[PDB]
């Protein structure tokens, strides 16, 4: 119902090095009624859904309007980190 | 012959009734007989090939081929280009007459009558029968002095075991 | 005491002409050993699989569907 719904830029170039330090999760969405955007996230809002709601349950991205029903596809990190990278959302509708 | 008129009169329409072909063009037929005589001993003696070609030319109406080697193996003691066997293709009316001879003459010259061996099954209308021996009227004791045999490979246009069995059965082939 | 260290010599393959040159008669375009590029308009294959330029003009490279490529010359 509510998440970290933000937007990004086309090529935010190598500033992403600093995104590795001060704690942001860059994320990815592409689907049916909206083609493709990248969206910010933080790690303290989705692992709580992974524990509480589960690893493969429904996420409702909201643009203060109609629903966007995404699901996880892949999130594999670099090792010896314990922090999120490469979150590919993937929406399949109702 | 006998068998073509058997097709045109009696063999076809009962087989049509058993399976209800919407066209007469789906009557399965008989094409080929392939006859082979693998020797192996002729590598030792080139005079072994002097007689099998004569025997096959007497039984058929054709001189058979002289088959190649296709391999080079010393564990079977063969180079390339080695004359080993002999093919006979058969088409047309000599097909039917040779099958007539097989029905009337060959099968009642078999020791220990038990029936034609069934298990040549192969699914797709391909029954082969090994022949071991003097099972033919155009053969003498004083001519044939070896224990050579024959080979039959009849290939049809059928698609089941059952239609192939009934093609061979309404024309003859007394199985077990 | 090593049983190695013996060499061929560099026989200097590779394209010797760009796209859009002004090319005279007969000059070499792309020297092969083995058919990596087929010829096209006004280009022949030598004994050692080279490529010519018969008609004076402009070298341009193309495709042959998916696999392999062509050289051809178009005059003025």
């Amino acid at each position: 119902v509510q998440l970290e719904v933000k937007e990004r830029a086309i090529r935010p170039r190598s500033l992403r090095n600093q995104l590795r330090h001060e704690g942001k999760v860059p994320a990815i969405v592409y689907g049916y009624q909206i083609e493709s955007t990248p969206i910010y996230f933080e790690e303290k809002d989705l692992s709580k859904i992974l524990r509480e709601h589960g690893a493969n349950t429904v996420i409702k991205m909201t643009v203060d309007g109609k629903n966007i029903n995404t699901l996880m596809s892949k999130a594999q990190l670099d090792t010896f980190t314990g922090q999120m990278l490469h979150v590919e959302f993937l929406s399949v509708n109702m | 012959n006998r068998l073509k008129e058997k097709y045109i009169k009696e063999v076809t329409p009962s087989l049509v009734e058993k399976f209800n072909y919407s066209s007469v063009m789906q009557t399965p037929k008989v094409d080929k007989i392939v006859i082979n005589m693998g020797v192996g001993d002729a590598v030792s003696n080139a005079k072994n090939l002097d007689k099998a070609v004569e025997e096959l030319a007497l039984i058929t109406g054709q001189k058979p081929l002289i088959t190649k080697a296709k391999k080079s193996i010393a564990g079977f003691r063969l180079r390339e280009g080695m004359p080993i066997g002999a093919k006979v293709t058969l088409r047309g009316e000599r097909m039917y007459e040779f099958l007539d001879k097989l029905v009337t003459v060959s099968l009642p010259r078999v020791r220990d009558f038990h029936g034609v061996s069934k298990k040549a099954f192969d699914g797709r209308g391909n029954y082969t029968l090994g022949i071991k021996e003097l099972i033919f009227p155009e053969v003498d004791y004083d001519l044939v002095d070896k224990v050579r045999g024959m080979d039959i490979v009849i290939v049809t246009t059928a698609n089941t075991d059952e239609e192939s069995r009934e093609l061979l059965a309404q024309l003859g082939m007394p199985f077990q | 005491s090593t049983s190695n260290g013996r060499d061929s010599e560099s026989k200097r393959l590779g394209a010797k002409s760009a796209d859009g040159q002004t090319v005279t008669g007969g000059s070499i375009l792309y020297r092969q050993r083995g058919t990596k590029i087929y010829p096209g308009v006004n280009v022949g294959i030598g004994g050692d699989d080279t490529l010519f330029a018969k008609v004076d003009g402009v070298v341009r490279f193309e495709r042959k569907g998916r696999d392999k490529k062509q050289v051809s010359v178009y005059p003025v």
């Binding site: 992974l50 690893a55 493969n56 999130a75 594999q76 990190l77 090792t79 010896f80 | - | 005491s1 190695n4």
Partner: protein
């Protein structure tokens, strides 16, 4: 001096390698695994030591997964031979591990024996470690 894990060659010699970085390659079979955090060669015999320090806390078997295997070879000269002639004789069988290939995996046993086994395993390998589950897994069939 016996090698636990030999190969079949195709080639006596290889170049001395150059390792930088990898990632990913999560826990797949078992339930408890290390992660190398550094970059070195790891030889044959260290894997023998890791096997034995794994198993001699394990009781009645359990589950042991080895996910790293030697492939490449070393050479060395004699003592006192000058620089000069061709490469040394091939001796040993080594394979490098970058930042994060999981070393081994365990399952079927509760955590305490597992963490003892992984501490015993980690003190016989020259690389710093951690301990990982199937921690964050959306793919679990």
């Amino acid at each position: 001096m016996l090698v636990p894990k030999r190969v079949k060659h195709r080639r006596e010699f290889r170049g001395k390698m150059r390792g930088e970085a990898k990632g990913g390659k999560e826990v797949a079979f078992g339930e408890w695994g290390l992660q190398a955090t550094e970059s070195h060669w790891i030889t044959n015999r260290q894997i023998e030591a890791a096997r034995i320090a794994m198993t001699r806390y394990m009781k009645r078997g359990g589950k042991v997964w080895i996910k790293i295997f030697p492939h490449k070879s070393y050479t060395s000269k004699a003592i006192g031979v000058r620089m000069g002639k061709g490469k040394g004789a091939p001796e040993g069988w080594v394979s490098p591990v970058k930042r994060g290939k999981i070393m081994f995996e365990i399952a079927g046993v509760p955590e305490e024996v597992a963490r003892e086994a992984l501490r015993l395993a980690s003190h016989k390998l020259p690389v710093k470690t951690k301990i990982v589950k199937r921690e964050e897994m959306g793919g679990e069939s």
